[PDB]
């Protein structure tokens, strides 16, 4: 029921009016013109992430890299940054009147450098995993055959890729379709700024519906399309051995430039411009900053406890009791990830309008959309940890002395919590920086962080704003850092 | 060791839903005795381990461990030892926590030490079974395993995971470890060397059904089936008709071990026959001459059988014969008319 | 001896983290001939397949291959086939198309076809390397590498994973493949009775050096160090005194492959010795009794009043001794003198 009956409506709505006015809504140009956008956007979003993603995994899996995993954490760090944050940095930072002497660029090409700086590094880490998990002794194979190395890159290590392209290209496309800080800080015309358009400005509900029913459309398509290629394409270790890196030489310098260009670019520039920025802070500002602050607490508590509430069963029945629910719930969890935030919300809205009118307006509401919302996102961390203990390793523990309850506390328990722990800081994170789903389902007058920034920097007020952001920045990075840390540690 | 049973099974019935695994398993097990289970992959001997250890509830039959019947007993009520093809290793803890996982005196770490030094692993007793090669997680579990003093260990495949060159070493230290603390195990393998040097005795499967057990030269000298005949080495297989004392094959007049009439099936081993130059009797071509160090064993394709039919023969390092010679086959041993 | 070498490796050495891991390795394979290496786990076996196929540089030597240096090629331009222990198989592409990935031409797959013929596996053509068993994964690997035709093929231990069943028929069906072709192999087992069966040279590795190479026979009955008879098979270091065309040691008498004088070591083989009803001569007790299968090794300790010594006596399946008996050695073979 997380989006079984939240979505259901979102068609339901839209198809309630004239059969001519759903023939009138159909036939606009505008929808041309968004489809238009949003592909053109994402395909120069996966460009770019590809040119920034494929060579960094290159370098920082097959060559004799100073400091694999620095690079690594260095090249993974930008995804602390969300995407109106980087849209804020870039309007500040340009322009006239701007930190640096530069004209503030169009709304696509901005749009299309922060996208893709804050979306790479979902490509890189698919890349660098598929990378490491190729058996070497293929490679010398298909070299022992007559294939000189770049031949052999092409037909041995690419296909082998190609599943990680795929995965990644899917995320990085799902998180174009969804995105609406960035494309509507800088004004850029996609679905989720004209659904947000038609809601508020222009009060159109009935075509905003509409173009959620075609996003949604769009994801769907997407997801069939890739399950299709996955199923392709499926190609079903090699104990994963090291094979002597290739060699730089004079080319080490080179190579760390190219891997610094990021990092740069979205983790330390932004930093520099906030702090640049928050200077000129007005103190009458500071008291909207703690309820701000206190406000994105009080939001975010109760969203990771109930994200790791429904984690936890799920993912105990998808691993010890595998079942049709199991599946079900996943594929349910995961569509609630995926789904756009701003349609997923105006989902919710009309849902709630439907049926519990009592909901529509709290922070109950609020709550709940944003846990179902970060159900994967707990989920992952609680996956990796239930499948680090088998049921065999109870029975192992059984064997030895244990009752059930205490082959459990003693063998899954010590992993399961920190599982949780792990999920819940991330779900904390993830809603202490949402901005589609709280800016449209919050209750009137209620104002977090990302909602406190978006609305400064679209009033074009950009020192009072730098606090707020130099907050979600830091803890987001923080966060990042500390569970990267974790996860090296386990 | 012992005129008493340790283990003993009667009865053993076991179905999955409605494929029954088990079909009336009986089994007797001595203390400091070593008994290795084998079958044609697919006889429930896993399903037999599990069924001691408590991991599963047979839907008939009986359970005895040290003259006491353990049939209903919970896993952990019984008091025998596991080792899994896993090793099924704790990711959380040290290799000495989890040898004191078993320990209930407050998980004695002393007792643990010394399980690990039997095994041959102090300088490694702090390392998380991530960071642990396969023959030192072979040990750890196996320490694991014996730290609180079973009378009894199930080994379900252990040294099927290693290489081929340490198996050779691991097997004999399990077996002197086992032996000198004082243990009977039970075996489940799908190995020849490991079934004639570590078991002490051997038990065959026939479809979760126990058709043969003995010492594994008792089963080498008198198989019942041609699964177990090869098995347990290379041998001849040879249609043939029994009229008494003898049979009649394709080689000629064969002894039988002790009686059959009819038509039968006879397992008639290389060391049971001779390469004499070409005379009376069945005559043959030699097609191969593999050289094993102290002996030899040719391959003889035989003239007057009209179906094409090749027999191994065991020889001597000092046979002055070659390949592609003529030869003559000579029955000196005595056969073994298998029931199928 | 063609009287051309083929492969011809000369100080070939390898340091890993200054670890000398080749120490002056030389060779010299013949067109045709298949030599195994046999040694501990270790001794650089892998890393002289490694060097010879161009997957690893070597830090000094020259390698030959057809007259012509090949140290300083790349794997690309040698032409030399390589089976990897995995088979190293492409898992993008089915079994056919791995076959014709290292073929050239305009029928590439036409050959391919003929390559598949030759192992024979013409009916699993468009199956990719998961639809495949291990049994077949590794004729596969073998008609991939043998597509191209080359003249050398180096075979990193082809024969380990497949199962014991069929192991012996896969090695000769390998090895018709290699001899009709006309193929010359390099392998590397651990197996003994692998390399002392399939292959046509031996080379025994210790530390990176070629201890002995020769054919299996005469590395097997006339070894030339202590570690190499205790290697290639048990056996009994005795420390005598040759006096001639024979020894005197605790044993007694023993006769000499090579006449010696002055004081030496032994290497009698147990099949070199028998046992005897307790008569006038050497004296000892049975203290084991191991079945092999085929033959039995009795070990026994003497009783002439020396420190402890065991001996090891390779016996018939029928011997009617058994473990704690009155035994006297015969010795019926010859004990060679090794060089320290």
Known sequence: ?490 | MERAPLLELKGIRKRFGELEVLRGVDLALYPGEILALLGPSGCGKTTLLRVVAGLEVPDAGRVFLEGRDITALPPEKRGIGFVFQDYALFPHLTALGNVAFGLKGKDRLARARKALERVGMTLFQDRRPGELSGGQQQRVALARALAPGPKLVLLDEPFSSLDAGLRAATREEVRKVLKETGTAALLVTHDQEEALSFADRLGVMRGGEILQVGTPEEVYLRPKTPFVAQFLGRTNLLPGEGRGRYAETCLGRVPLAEAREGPLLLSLRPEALRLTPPGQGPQGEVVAREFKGHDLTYRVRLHGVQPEREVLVQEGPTCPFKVGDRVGLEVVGEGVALEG
């Open chain 1, 1 to 490: 029921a997380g989006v079984l009956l939240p979505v259901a409506y979102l068609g339901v709505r839209a198809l309630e009016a004239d059969p001519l006015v759903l023939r009138e809504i159909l036939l606009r140009p505008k929808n041309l013109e968004l489809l238009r956008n949003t592909l053109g956007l994402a395909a120069g979003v996966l460009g770019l992430a590809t040119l920034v993603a494929l060579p960094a995994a290159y370098l920082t899996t097959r060559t004799d890299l100073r400091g694999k995993r620095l690079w690594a954490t260095l090249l993974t760090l930008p995804l602390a940054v969300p995407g109106y944050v980087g849209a804020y940095v870039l309007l500040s930072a340009t322009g006239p009147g701007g930190l640096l002497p530069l004209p503030r660029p169009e709304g696509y090409w901005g749009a299309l450098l922060v996208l893709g700086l804050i979306t790479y590094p979902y490509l890189f880490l698919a890349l660098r995993a598929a990378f490491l998990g190729v058996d070497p002794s293929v490679e010398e194979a298909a070299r022992t055959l007559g294939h000189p190395p770049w031949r052999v890159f092409l037909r041995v290590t690419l296909p082998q890729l190609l599943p990680a392209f795929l995965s990644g290209y899917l995320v990085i496309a799902l998180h174009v379709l969804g995105d609406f800080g960035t494309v509507s800080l800088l004004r850029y015309e996609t679905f989720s700024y004209a659904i947000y358009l038609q809601y508020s400005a222009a009060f159109d509900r009935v075509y905003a519906a509409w173009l959620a029913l075609f996003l949604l459309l769009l994801t769907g398509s997407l997801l069939l399309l890739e399950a299709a290629l996955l199923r392709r394409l499926s190609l079903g270790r090699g104990a994963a051995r090291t094979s002597p890196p290739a060699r730089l030489g004079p080319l080490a310098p080179l190579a760390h430039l190219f891997l610094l260009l990021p990092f740069l670019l979205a983790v330390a520039f932004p930093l520099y411009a906030l702090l640049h920025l928050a200077r000129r802070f007005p103190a009458s500002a500071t008291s909207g900053l703690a309820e701000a602050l206190g406000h994105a607490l009080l939001v975010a508590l109760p969203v990771a406890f109930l994200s790791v509430g429904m984690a936890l069963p799920i993912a105990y029945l998808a691993s010890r009791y595998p079942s049709a629910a199991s599946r079900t719930l996943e594929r349910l969890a995961y569509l609630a990830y995926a789904i756009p935030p701003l349609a997923y919300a105006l989902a919710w809205i009309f849902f709630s309008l439907r049926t519990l009118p009592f909901l529509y307006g709290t922070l109950a509401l609020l709550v709940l959309a944003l846990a179902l919302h970060f159900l994967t996102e707990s989920l992952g961390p609680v996956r990796s940890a239930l499948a680090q203990v088998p049921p065999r390793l109870e029975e192992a523990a059984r064997t030895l002395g244990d009752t059930p309850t205490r082959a459990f506390f003693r063998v899954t328990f010590p992993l399961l919590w920190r599982g949780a722990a792990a999920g819940g800081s991330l779900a904390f994170i993830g809603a202490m920086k949402e901005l589609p789903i709280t800016l449209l389902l919050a209750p009137t007058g209620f104002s977090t962080l990302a909602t406190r920034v978006f609305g400064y920097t679209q009033e074009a007020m950009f020192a009072e704003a730098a606090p707020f952001a130099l907050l979600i920045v830091g803890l987001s990075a923080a966060f990042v850092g500390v569970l990267l840390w974790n996860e090296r540690r386990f």
